[PDB]
């Protein structure tokens, strides 16, 4: 079990389909709720991580997810 920028592995997996390059889907409730305790500036630090490629994450969709979730703050990356 890990904490990456406020999100557990379970929560990152919950959000994964809403940031996938291929066939993304609308964010789930559990994803949006978890993002309410995530550290966006911390998450932005992963913008160039090889992990985005490995997990098929789209950095643009990832950037867009807080707004999709109706959060008031949004990731400066
Ligand atoms: C900067 C603005 C904010 C950006 C917001 C980003 C939101 C979240 C980004 C999500 C990235 C998702 C990467 C997924 C990594 C999951 C870890 C993993 O490898 O999975 C763990 C497996 O063990 C689970 O597999 P399983 O489902 O349990 O088994 C079937
Ligand atoms: C254009 C706009 C740009 C904005 C960019 C926004 C970027 C958003 C970044 C969020 C990315 C976070 C991805 C982190 C994936 C964690 C991988 C991981 O946790 O590794 C776990 C497994 O590998 C190990 O597996 P295990 O056995 O379960 O270990 C327990
Ligand atoms: Zn652990
Ligand atoms: Zn959490
Ligand atoms: Zn949570």
Curated annotation (Swiss-Prot):
A 1-acyl-sn-glycero-3-phosphocholine binds at residues 9, 13. This is Putative lipid-transfer protein DIR1. Putative lipid transfer protein required for systemic acquired resistance (SAR) long distance signaling. May interact with a lipid-derived molecule to promote long distance signaling associated with SAR. Together with AZI1, required for glycerol-3-phosphate- (G3P) and azelaic acid- (AA) induced systemic acquired resistance (SAR). Component of plant systemic immunity involved in priming defenses in a AA-dependent manner, by modulating production and/or translocation of a mobile signal(s) during SAR. Is able to bind with high affinity monoacylated phospholipids, mainly lysophosphatidylcholines. Disulfide bonds join 5-42, 15-31, 32-69, 44-77. It comes from Arabidopsis thaliana. Induction: Induced by glycerol-3-phosphate (G3P). Keywords: Apoplast, Cell junction, Disulfide bond, Endoplasmic reticulum, Lipid transport, Lipid-binding, Metal-binding, Plant defense, Secreted, Signal, Transport, Zinc. GO terms for molecular function: fatty acid binding; zinc ion binding. It is found in: Secreted, Extracellular space, Apoplast; Endoplasmic reticulum; Cell junction, Plasmodesma. Binds 1 zinc ion per subunit. Self-interacts and binds to AZI1. Does not interact with PDLP1. Disruption phenotype: No visible phenotype under normal growth condition, but compromised pathogen-induced glycerol-3-phosphate-(G3P) and azelaic acid- (AA) dependent systemic acquired resistance (SAR). GO terms for cellular component: apoplast; endoplasmic reticulum; plasmodesma; secretory vesicle. Belongs to the A9/FIL1 family. It comes from the Eukaryota. Zn(2+) binds at residues 11, 37.
């Amino acid at each position: 079990a890990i904490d990456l920028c406020g999100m557990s592995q379970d929560e990152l997996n919950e959000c994964k389909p809403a940031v996938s390059k291929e066939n993304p889907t609308s964010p789930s409730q559990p994803c949006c709720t978890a993002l309410q305790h995530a550290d966006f500036a911390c998450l932005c630090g992963y913008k160039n991580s090889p992990w985005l490629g490995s997990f098929g994450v789209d950095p643009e969709l990832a950037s867009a997810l807080p707004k999709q979730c109706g959060l008031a703050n949004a990731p400066t990356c």
